Write a new protein. Structure first.
Lengths: 36, 48
């Protein structure tokens, strides 16, 4: 379901791998870091 | 290089090629290679 965006354009990076989501009885901590 | 149908020179495509290793050593199995005069980095300095 592509209900997030409407219009598309020139993509720069694509990545497919094992999913980040895996397995209220589970904690999932995430830290995002954009340096250099 | 080894495709089937090519595009015309007024409708020339532009495919963005990225996120790999770039092996330029697969350019030797074709017809005897009439044009490789480069205008930038030398052909011996393409693999580094």
């Amino acid at each position: 379901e592509f209900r997030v965006y409407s219009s598309a354009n020139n993509c720069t990076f694509e990545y497919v791998s094992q999913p980040f989501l895996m397995d209220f009885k589970n904690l999932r901590e995430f830290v995002f870091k954009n340096i250099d | 290089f080894n495709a089937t149908r090519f595009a015309s020179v007024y409708a020339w495509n532009r495919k963005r090629i990225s996120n790999c290793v770039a092996d330029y050593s697969v350019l030797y199995n074709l017809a005897p290679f009439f044009t490789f005069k480069c205008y930038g980095v030398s052909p011996t300095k393409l693999n580094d």
